[model samples]
Target: DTHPLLGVGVTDPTNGTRVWESELDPDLLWLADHVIDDLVVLPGAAYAEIALAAATDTFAVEQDQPWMISELDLRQMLHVTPGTVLVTTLTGDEQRCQVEIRTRSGSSGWTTHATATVARAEPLTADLEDQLDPDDLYQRLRGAGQQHGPAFQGIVGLAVTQAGVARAQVRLPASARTGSREFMLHPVMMDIALQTLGATRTATDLSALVVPVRFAGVHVYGDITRGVRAVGSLAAAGDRLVGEVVLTDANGQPLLVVDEVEMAVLGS
Candidate 1:
């Protein structure tokens, strides 16, 4: 029921439980939308979205309720190559559900590249957070223009607050919007928050290919609106990265609170 629009599908069901599989190529439009030092790899936001979908269906999660990702570990990179395939599995009982991504290439055996667990979340609330200076922040982003493309340029504008905190506006291209009201945040729009990491990390030169490797204590409290604004922060975890993001409505009301998103930066 879920993969056609998302552009992926489930294969081989058993006990009414199964996994999603998709063939991937770097030349694909979706993969080309992102450019990290000239290398096209799977985006972390996709991992987040797939995990959410897998858990919701497998556990019968309520749409009105909050959901939390207890853990997600991105074990390796799934670079786009000829004949590469992505295999995702969702398994668990009522308490918690696990989602995993394993990839196979013509050169190697199936390897687990990412994994996660979804569970119930408690009630939550959010206040109008800080804001970012659109002009100045974007100027800084333009500083890294040599490495960014249309898809990587998701941040329409922004204003930074603390070192790793600020408010930002992100939108999806017409190609990326699915018009599905089921999920809180659209995967491509959500990836924009990660794009903000470039500022906090001061990697304006696009020196490396940074991506999501792990997520701990991530909570999604409400539905995220497309082409909406996000108030979030990127915290530096040594060589890794973490984002505490909140998606908001038109009136600046909080719609979603995502926390402790972990990422890794790969070399060129």
Candidate 2:
């Protein structure tokens, strides 16, 4: 089955480009829970899923084959509304493909939201000593204007290494787990993994809403559900911050590696 957010897809016989079209409804349960300062914005991880799924379909890769996405650039924020048209387009060859996601409202022209390069890649962490309270963390986030609702509140445990690496234990709440089986990499799971970057920030940094705008070398080893550990590190990049995170199982088996995640302060 196709991802719930990605509707029907069709391939162009002449150009060999593939496109998927779907309408996003404001009533979608997940949208209400992923707010960033009063805006029901789509998570960056959702774009990753859409790109990965489109690449998998475009290339007809075996289910067990290894692949990754790189150079993912999110150009615009997608705000969900009733009858919002969501479209994903793929172009390129078996070795690599360029995927672009766009959206429009009613009769308006489509606006590109995200673009990434997908290709085959071989599948390839942290010392954390300080245990942190998840409740306190969430409270801090709320004060920072994150405003993540119940479904997006997947951080159950958190700690920071002496070297500044952030480790977080994430479990998808029941509200976010619906139709999770259909995703090769669940967006909420990855979103929580990205959220671990928050632990490495200072109080000043928390005052601003930071969000990912670009990703590099995002490798997926396998799918995960329920529980996972997110280990992350961040470094200052001028006015922005770049982060890297690894999502793993309870035994520390790596599930996904997100590198060079460039995040900028929203409205800055």
Candidate 3:
């Protein structure tokens, strides 16, 4: 009774270790609501959530340092199917924990989809630099939808604060709120935040169809539930993009703060 999997998977904390397994299918409520280019893929944010949760349940209290995801790399896309089995194995000590995710198709061998590191939540600071206009931002978002599917169109009431800062309102409908209360920043909302990167006013053209390939220092300030106003900013780092985002409630209470997220052009 000491293990919980958010109804999406099964967790085993036996032999003084942590292990989890789940059958991944697009039909599931949360997974079903998010589809891209006719493909049901798990949002990168969810991968981080699952890793941190497993590490938290197993290592947090013991180490006395709240568990958090320090780094995450998406090696392969996780496509949902009737025969795909997703498994996550967590192993580590007080200072660091490693999480590896592999998938199996029916009788086939496992393929690694993601690998991550879990460590104590650390302190950091960032300043917002830009604002956005809701009307214009929505128009841009709608225009960009031609490339990114409906699953990504979630930005609302936004105003650009500066070149690298964007402000917007986000909400997760009942359908998107499916399964486990494990994630404070729902996948739909998290993906929506990433979508703002496209609106981030680059050198000249809009960063359309951008993709998230790597993330580091993803810190959640607090729980973001239902509807809230959020802000995200991005900066060009040589060939890649680096940025941070913050979400707050109606009262302006802190919700989620993504310390650093890196992105790449869709086909580059």
Best TM-score among the predictions, by candidate number: 2
The parts of candidate 1 lying over 4 Å away from their true place are 1-17, 27-29, 106-108, 125-148, 162-164, 178-184, 201-206, 209-211, 221-223, 237-241
Model 2 residue 134 CA deviation (Å) reads: 1.7
Give a tens-digit lDDT track for model 1, residues 1-268.
3452133545455554566667777665566666544567667766777777766655555556546778878787666676577777777766777778787655456788888887777565343434555445544544433244465556777665545455577765555544445454456666765566555533332334445566776666455534367666666668666766667667766665566766555555
What lDDT does candidate 2 reach at residue 15? 89
lDDT of the candidates, in the order given: 0.62, 0.81, 0.63
Q: Report the lDDT tens digits of candidate 3 across residue range 6-103.
A: 22434454644455667667776566555545567777777776777667655537433265678889888787777567777778785688888878
In angstroms, the error of model 1 at 170 is 2.2
Which scores greater on TM-score, model 1 or model 2? 2
TM-score of candidate 3 on Cα atoms, chains taken together: 0.78
Please name the candidate that would achieve the greatest lDDT relative to the true structure: 2
- TM-score of every model? 0.75, 0.91, 0.78
**Per-model RMSD to reference:** 4.7, 2.3, 4.5
Question: Distance (Å) between predicted and true CA of 183, model 1?
Answer: 5.3
Q: List the residue pairs that clash in candidate 1.
A: 132-158, 132-159, 132-160, 133-159
